[PDB]
């Protein structure tokens, strides 16, 4: 089925954001498990896999709309060097991708592409859940301290 | 454990090649399923997952050697538009990726990094298996014809 | 027990024929799997294993008759290069092996070695089944075409 | 995939050695069971099956490298007449194949055919285990005597 | 069904041989058990039971052909007094019973009594198996010694 | 099978290092469990068991090569007094045996003792994993503090 | 809990004896399995493991008494060249072990370290059982001969 060109452009932009998130989250997850923080590494790995599933869904939607997925464009990775830094980098990545999803949802509503809007709404809910988790982790770091928090992530 | 810098550079080169393969294979797999070729799409998806696991193993090895994985650089993907074309593109990608693995194995032998050598040997064996599969598919296309071959890829 | 010398000579001749068949069928089976023809490869592998069991049975019979099995002699191998050629080579070998079995059965009747005749009768019944299968495959090739036939051997 | 011609030659030579071992070990196994020595016959049969699997692996590797396996050439078998001679013949045959395997592994190292090196290394370890077993049996014959040794091989 | 009179005579002769075998083998088995050689006694008992089944089959075949089974004639038993002697006696009986079976099979072929020929062929195969076992046991005695051999027959 | 004398010398040196590691790790595990740090005690116990298996494998290889294992010589023991000190002592011991394994692997490659090279390669991989765990533990001590770290080792 | 210094000295001496026994028994077990003597190898392996558990118990007891286990010093190792000689060496080691255990038990009685006496009593009973087994094996060698004895150790 032929889709709207601007809808395909929005889907490609979201796909590029998801591609950035996949690499950033996987590298963060692997650097967490390297330091012995199995809990944080496992959670970041699960979030990365969720990002891969989001990218797969976007690729399927673009292909159904007779568009061309853009896997080539990989943007800047926001990689941190310590646990707090990587948590803030992940939160900033999540926040920076939120306006794009909202704009895509609004445009899909405006031109009557309701299935794409439903898919983007599911993606937006997932991104909001990740944002909530990251903010909760940072607040916990503030409440209990860095050492206690890092101890809680040991196992 | 501190590793050799040149070994880190070789591992980063292989990791970049693996990322290229991941993106190209996932795109080809999802374009196969869109055409109704479930079998070819499933095999391409499995190949992409294997490339993902190779990239994960390389990232783990680089992080163990106190290096910095380079996931930021994504090179040119060889994306095809018809089944024969994308099979040939995958074959070209695999053939181009072989010399880097062999050079990395030779260097690991030279400097005595034997665990990295075993890792790269496993990766090389997997790449050779994929090459064998791709060549078998192309020869089967030449033997039984494109129309017969594409029919067997349904379901 | 001590058997007839000429019976042992006939058994040795059939054993050499079976060894030739083992080698040819195993090579054909392996080059079938390499091309991607799983069905033909599996059937040729099973036929090869049947030839191996026949050779083992002949070795046991020769040993019981206080003779020396002759595994040193390996004659000409009729190795084909394309599927039809392989099938015709196997059929030609199987047809050339038949007169020796019939002559040996007749001789075992002449001198009253009835257990050896029963063994050779079982072997001959198996060889006739292999001939029937090969002829059926060639007739199917001539009936449905080479490309259609090769597609059915993919899986 | 096209491999090195000299690597294919080494693989073919090792395949011929494996075929010789297959024939010799099967004949020895069968003449062991004829004497009532079930244990020695069973172990020789298992060794012959292992040699068959080695030959199969070599055939597959040669086929992958786009070469022609040489099943035609079968060299001299080292057949014994009593148990001690059979064991010494098997040990001599196994020790005469180690230099070929070692040279092939060294050459595969030289030209960077690492998958072939891994295959040859696996079969070399198997041959070394067979040599260990043969030497242990020959030393046990001298430790406990021929009559005591043959009695333990009955059941 | 009315059979051929000479076929009935041959069957009666074979039955008379089978009865002698039954008695001799049962007696040998019982003295083997009495001496404490449970393994040899068990094998001899099984051999006697097999001869018993052969006699039963012969009686059934004679009765089907409207003939009169002759169980009255019991000829001389070859009873031994030590293990080697009774193994040799069994071998002598089994070898002396062979020409009658072969002559009966030849006559059944000549007159066209094919079912009787199949029965006698099965009997002949069994007798050959017993001959093989007896010769193997005697060769084992000559190879490992009487004292070692008898120790293996305790259980 | 007779092996190279220098290869046996290298294996003997590695075996002595393994025995040193066995004794030191067992003592460290016992004092860890004595202080009430069950997790550290359990991991040190498992590491000591792994060292025991390494020593067993080396002894088997030396005996197969017709050499004489040197269990008599046991070198100095790097015994620590506190958790940080014993972790550092274990890391130093593991780093001080790595060059020996690397030199042994290089020599086994040079003279063609490939099975010994594979055994030493497996041992080297195990020692590298132990080094990774020890460095991770020390970095975790630095990250979360000694008091927090020791609390997590209680259960 | 603080214990007597002399009790700790006795425990350390017993621990050194146990370490000597561990090394000697493991080496003897390995060469027993190398020669093909599975029964003797398995029993020596189990005896060695029992010695390891004895040493572990002694280490725990020394650590509980707030002492310092002496794992460093490894004394003479009575290694034999043939089965009879190694059995005599093991018996000599076990017999030389006894007086130290008896003196330690008597001293623990004298100063009222009753738990240590119970531990040493269990160890003494185990050593007495090993002595009984070793003397039984030597008496069996005398009764049935070396060649007959070694045959029973094959499997
Ligand atoms: C640096 C890049 C990537 C790495 C290191 C990576 C790694 C992985 C790993 C280790 C798995 C686990 C496989 C398993 O457990 O069987 C996985 C699963 C998966 N990945 Fe990736 N991946 C990457 C990029 C991508 C991309 C770009 C996509 C899609 C556009 C993708 C799609 C998937 C899917 C669909 C799965 C399976 C999900 C499931 O089984 O439920 N991945 N990946
Ligand atoms: C004198 C020559 C040979 C004899 C008498 C012989 C005999 C046998 C027998 C009796 C079996 C057992 C099959 C079963 O139990 O199902 C067997 C298995 C096998 N043979 Fe041989 N064989 C010979 C040569 C070869 C050769 C030349 C090859 C390959 C080049 C080969 C490859 C195999 C394989 C792959 C198996 C199956 C192993 C398995 O299923 O685990 N054999 N052979
Ligand atoms: C010096 C050379 C040594 C060698 C070659 C050796 C070898 C072994 C082996 C092969 C095992 C079997 C592990 C398993 O089956 O999972 C084992 C277990 C064990 N070893 Fe070591 N060991 C040595 C020294 C020691 C020492 C010095 C001690 C104590 C002071 C010790 C204590 C133990 C214990 C407690 C076990 C567990 C046994 C069980 O769980 O049943 N070992 N050893």
Swiss-Prot record, chains A, B, C, D, E, F, G:
Transmembrane portions of the chain: none
Database matches in Gene3D superfamilies: 1.20.1260.10
Biological process according to GO: intracellular iron ion homeostasis; iron ion transport
Residues annotated as binding Fe cation 2: 51, 94, 127, 130
Signal peptide stretch: none
Subunit comment: Homooligomer of 24 subunits, arranged as 12 dimers, that are packed together to form an approximately spherical molecule with a central cavity, in which large amounts of iron can be deposited.
Family the UniProt entry places it in: Belongs to the bacterioferritin family.
Function comment: Iron-storage protein, whose ferroxidase center binds Fe(2+), oxidizes it using dioxygen to Fe(3+), and participates in the subsequent Fe(3+) oxide mineral core formation within the central cavity of the BFR protein shell.
Name of the protein: Bacterioferritin
């Amino acid at each position: 089925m032929k889709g709207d060109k601007i809808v395909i452009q929005h889907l490609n932009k979201i796909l590029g954001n998801e591609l950035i998130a996949i690499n950033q989250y996987f590298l963060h997850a692997r650097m967490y498990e390297d330091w012995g923080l199995e809990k944080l590494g496992k959670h970041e790995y699960h979030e990365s896999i969720d990002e891969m599933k989001h990218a797969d869904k976007l690729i399927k939607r673009i292909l159904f709309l007779e568009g061309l997925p853009n896997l080539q464009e990989l943007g800047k990775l926001l990689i941190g060097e310590h646990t707090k830094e990587m948590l803030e980098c992940d939160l900033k990545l999540e926040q920076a991708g939120l306006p794009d999803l909202k704009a895509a949802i609004a445009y899909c509503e405006s031109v009557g592409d309701y299935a794409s809007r439903e898919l983007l709404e599911d993606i937006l809910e997932s991104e909001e859940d990740h944002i909530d988790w990251l903010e909760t982790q940072l607040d916990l770091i503030d409440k209990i301290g860095l050492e206690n928090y890092l101890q809680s992530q040991m196992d």
